[PDB]
Amino acid sequence: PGRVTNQLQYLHKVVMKALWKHQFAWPFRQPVDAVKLGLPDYHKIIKQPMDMGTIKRRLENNYYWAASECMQDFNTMFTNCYIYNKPTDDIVLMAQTLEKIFLQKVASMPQEEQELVV
Amino acid sequence: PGRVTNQLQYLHKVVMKALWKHQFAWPFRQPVDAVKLGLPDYHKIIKQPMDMGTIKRRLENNYYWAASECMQDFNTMFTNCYIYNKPTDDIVLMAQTLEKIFLQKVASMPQEEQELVV
Ligand SMILES: COc1cc2c(cc1-c1c(C)noc1C)ncc1[nH]c(=O)n([C@H](C)c3ccccn3)c12
Numbered sequence: 001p002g003r004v005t006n007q008l009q010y011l012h013k014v015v016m017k018a019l020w021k022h023q024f025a026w027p028f029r030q031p032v033d034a035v036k037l038g039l040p041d042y043h044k045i046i047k048q049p050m051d052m053g054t055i056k057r058r059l060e061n062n063y064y065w066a067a068s069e070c071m072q073d074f075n076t077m078f079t080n081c082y083i084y085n086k087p088t089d090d091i092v093l094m095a096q097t098l099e100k101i102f103l104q105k106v107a108s109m110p111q112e113e114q115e116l117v118v
Numbered sequence: 119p120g121r122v123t124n125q126l127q128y129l130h131k132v133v134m135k136a137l138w139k140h141q142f143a144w145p146f147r148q149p150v151d152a153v154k155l156g157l158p159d160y161h162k163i164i165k166q167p168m169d170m171g172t173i174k175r176r177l178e179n180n181y182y183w184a185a186s187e188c189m190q191d192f193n194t195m196f197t198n199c200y201i202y203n204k205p206t207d208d209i210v211l212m213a214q215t216l217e218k219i220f221l222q223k224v225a226s227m228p229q230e231e232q233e234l235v236v
């Protein structure tokens with residue numbers, strides 16, 4: 001059972017809003033389907049797949065207990081990409097651009113996490 | 119009880135080696151002493167403090183079970199910095215530079231994690 005916090009609210013309504021509509025977002029909006037994309041050994045290499053669609057649903061459904069967990073899912077999504085792919089690949093450059101934006105927005109997130117009731 | 123893996127070995131001998139000696143590394147090599155630095159409410163805002171000294175010791179002492187845990191400690195260190203400080207602060211620009219290097223190196227880490235025995 002997760003909860004609503006000021007930081008999670010910010011991650012939803014400011015961070016995810018900036019990322020979801022970005023030019024480079026579309027390949028990250030749903031899980032990597034390795035077989036359709038012809039990606040060998042994707043599930044040997046990546047044991048914790050993650051994508052922005054899953055994160056967005058989790059934010060919408062109060063899945064997270066704390067913003068740190070949501071930020072961990074973002075980090076996992078980006079590092080999965082960096083690990084599976086080559087440093088010069090289009091998808092890695094796209095991920096780097098998205099992560100730069102994510103981290104920039106995190107620098108203006110509310111500082112002290114407090115739960116919101118109603 | 120942690121273990122030695124090819125990825126943790128890479129994080130130690132390649133990633134931490136590149137970061138530890140960087141021009142901007144020195145403020146990150148030990149925990150943030152908020153009172154000496156005159157940083158109000160540091161421990162209200164940051165509930166999971168982390169630094170490269172602690173990570174380096176953990177790598178040296180086989181504290182981690184998997185590279186994902188070490189990468190999470192790096193991410194926590196950087197996002198702690200971004201959260202406590204302002205987007206334009208010297209320390210945040212320094213952290214961003216270090217994180218760029220960290221993530222660049224992660225893109226060449228061994229892909230499939232396998233434990234090393236002896
Ligand atoms: C080449 O990387 C991808 C390409 C994708 C994709 C997800 C990834 C992806 C992501 C994201 N993280 O690891 C991988 C692998 N999801 C959908 C999708 N649809 C689609 O046409 N692609 C191609 C192959 C693509 C898109 C962008 C950049 C490079 N290649 C892709």
Ligand SMILES: COc1cc2c(cc1-c1c(C)noc1C)ncc1[nH]c(=O)n([C@H](C)c3ccccn3)c12
Nearest residue numbers: 144145146150151155157198199202203208209212
């Ligand atoms: C202004 O930020 C810091 C300054 C530090 C520091 C750690 C931080 C720090 C870190 C790293 N993450 O959050 C904070 C706060 N550790 C040691 C240390 N010794 C030292 O003289 N400083 C000053 C205030 C400094 C250094 C670099 C950039 C800006 N300000 C610092």
